[PDB]
UniProtKB/Swiss-Prot annotation:
Interacts with actin and cofilin in a ternary complex. GO terms for biological process: actin filament depolymerization; barbed-end actin filament capping; negative regulation of cytokinesis. Keywords: Acetylation, Actin-binding, Cytoplasm, Cytoskeleton, Repeat, WD repeat. The gene is AIP1. It holds the Pfam family WD40. The modification N-acetylserine is found at residue 1. GO terms for molecular function: actin binding; actin filament binding. Belongs to the WD repeat AIP1 family. This is Actin-interacting protein 1. It is found in: Cytoplasm, Cytoskeleton; Cytoplasm, Cytoskeleton, Actin patch. It comes from Saccharomyces cerevisiae (strain ATCC 204508 / S288c).
Length: 606
């Protein structure tokens, strides 16, 4: 008996309005790396099976939000380096096993380099030296050896935050840091030391957001930022050569990032929802790609060349845009969440995160209709969905059909188009999932922290005495208490599909199973988790007697308990960094999970 990882749907890159998201591409593994939440990710652009794992997730930054992920230049080195807001940098390496289909990640070195958050990282072409940069009190960046951490130079010339850096990928080594107040500094080195400074080519007070030396011998260095200027320096002397401008292509917005396709062409991307391709020599824009400027989400917050003219653009809305030099049309788009997932539906698969974004995977549709946490999702009605959010509304296919007078704490929908909601004002409401109408309601005697709506019952977890009261859907005036309360505040309740039992767990990790009818505990034998329970889902039949029950807790684990054999536990550890939020059975043998880490995972239950 087991559970094995069947598929991983990774989140989109982390984003912030007015801020660049530095991406990284690795030719060898044909994959890109990017930060999202508290984990670093590497996603293989390779569809057709390959020896490269689809996804690699590094959780080593613990509680610190990851800011940047960079591939080591050494082909096949499978090493990467990432930084976080706490100012810590980590060099880690992964491992894969196409067989077990298991990915291992082992840290190799960690360094507390900055007081504040790290903004960018860059390796030397030997994959042994690092330019780390960002913000601090006295230090705005450092130059250190990847294994020891001993200083290999000194970041200087900046008084304000450093935004990006880059190491000329060839000898004689040279470096570049760039940041706030139009500051651009050049270094020389192996022992990188201040060489030259510049505060005349980028407007004072502006933000220079990215810098990058041309591939091969790096004959040039280019910096970009909010003043819409593209400055071109010489890769050796660092002398300003010229601005890259084309009369037929005025830059109408601040630039966020750049990436060289080869030694002559490089891409830029910015607030004017445009992806432009330039030729350093002619200073002419050779190719342009646009998106509707009228939509905030189209601003281009990142970019990275992936070889042979292929370019990947990052939208403020987290979308990944694939383009190719010579082809005026966008090749394909990839959307998804970049915020913890809080609501889940199956057959068809739909997900919602705590920012209110909803994802329809059956049509690759991404919605930004709600503007806050998605409490629940209901797809019972054919080709439609009903969503409830902390933005106090109930929407049906992105359209508002109900405005709550009181915020919806938690909710639960059955299969007959009904949704039971518990509000901040301590009310239990029963809505018609698809019209938004409240057909019946009742004031609860105490705040409620959990709901489970079956075909005929409504089980509510009550904070006062952490008891479970069961309501009759058809008549809220009738109800009964289960003989035994919980240990601590109820966190999640799941009524049996046949309404025989009721599984309810608490914020401490206890999960009691009751017999609904007799309202008596049927077993408290299921193993204590020592962590908040966030999800419980009954496995359906392929016997027919309800037995296996999947559950998830803040501790990141998935525990599939058994009614018949309370001592037997099938488990999957580290399912989702920082906790499992949702759990569903889309197939009698397949589980689907969502986590605080904005990941969605499918599992094969053997
Ligand atoms: Zn929509």
């Amino acid at each position: 008996s087991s559970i094995s990882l069947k598929e991983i749907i990774p989140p989109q890159p982390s984003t912030q309005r007015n801020f660049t998201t530095h991406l990284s591409y690795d030719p060898t593994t044909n994959a890109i790396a990017y930060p999202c939440g508290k984990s670093a990710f590497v996603r293989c652009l390779d569809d057709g099976d390959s020896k490269v794992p689809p996804v690699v997730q590094f959780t080593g930054h613990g509680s610190s939000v990851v800011t940047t992920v960079k591939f080591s230049p050494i082909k096949g080195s499978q090493y990467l380096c990432s930084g976080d807001e706490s100012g810590k940098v980590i060099v880690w390496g992964w491992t894969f096993d196409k067989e077990s289909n298991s990915v291992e990640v082992n840290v190799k070195s960690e360094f507390q380099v900055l007081a504040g958050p790290i903004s960018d990282i860059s390796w030397d072409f030997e994959g042994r030296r690092l330019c780390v940069v960002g913000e601090g009190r006295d230090n705005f960046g450092v130059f250190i050896s990847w294994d020891s951490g001993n200083s290999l130079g000194e970041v200087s010339g900046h008084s304000q935050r450093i935004n990006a850096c880059h190491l000329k990928q060839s000898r004689p080594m040279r470096s570049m840091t760039v940041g706030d107040d139009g500051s651009v500094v050049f270094y020389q080195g192996p022992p990188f030391k201040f060489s030259a400074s510049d505060r005349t080519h980028h407007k004072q007070g502006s933000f220079v957001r990215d810098v990058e030396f041309s591939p091969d011998s790096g004959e040039f260095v280019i910096t970009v930022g909010s003043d819409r200027k593209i400055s071109c320096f010489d890769g050796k002397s660092g002398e300003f050569l010229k601005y890259i401008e084309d009369d037929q292509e005025p830059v109408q917005g601040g630039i966020f990032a750049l990436s060289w396709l080869d030694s002559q062409k490089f891409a830029t991307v910015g607030a004017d929802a445009t992806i432009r391709v330039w030729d350093v020599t002619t200073s002419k824009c050779v190719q342009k790609w646009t998106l509707d400027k009228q939509q905030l989400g189209n601003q281009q917050v990142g970019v990275v060349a992936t070889g042979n003219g292929r370019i990947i653009s990052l939208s403020l809305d987290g979308t990944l845009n694939f383009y190719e030099l010579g082809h005026d049309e966008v090749l394909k788009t990839i959307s998804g969440h970049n915020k913890g997932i809080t609501a889940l539906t199956v057959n068809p698969l739909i997900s919602g995160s705590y920012d209110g974004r909803i994802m329809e995977w059956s049509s690759s549709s991404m919605h930004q209709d709600h503007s806050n946490l998605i409490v629940s999702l209901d797809n019972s009605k054919a080709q439609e969905y009903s969503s409830i959010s902390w933005d106090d509304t109930l929407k049906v296919n992105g359209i508002t059909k109900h405005e709550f007078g009181s915020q919806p704490k938690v909710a639960s929908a059955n299969n007959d188009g009904f949704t039971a909601v518990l509000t901040n004002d301590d009310d239990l409401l029963i809505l018609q999932s698809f019209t938004g109408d409240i057909i019946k309601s009742v004031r609860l005697n105490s705040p409620g922290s959990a709901v489970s709506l079956s075909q005929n019952y409504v089980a509510v977890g009550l904070e006062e005495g952490n008891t479970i009261q069961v309501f009759k859907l058809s008549d809220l005036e009738v109800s009964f208490d289960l003989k035994t309360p919980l240990r601590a505040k109820p966190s999640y309740i799941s009524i049996s599909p046949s309404e025989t039992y009721i599984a309810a767990g608490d914020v401490m990790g206890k999960i009691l199973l009751y017999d609904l009818q007799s309202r008596e505990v049927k077993t408290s034998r299921w193993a204590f988790r020592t962590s908040k329970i966030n999800a419980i889902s009954w496995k359906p039949a392929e016997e027919i007697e309800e037995d296996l029950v999947a559950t998830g807790s803040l501790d990141t684990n998935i525990f599939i308990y058994s009614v018949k054999r309370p001592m037997k536990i099938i488990k999957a550890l580290n399912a989702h960094k920082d906790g499992v939020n949702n759990l569903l059975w889309e197939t009698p043998s397949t589980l689907v999970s969502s986590g605080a880490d904005a990941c969605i995972k499918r599992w094969n239950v053997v």
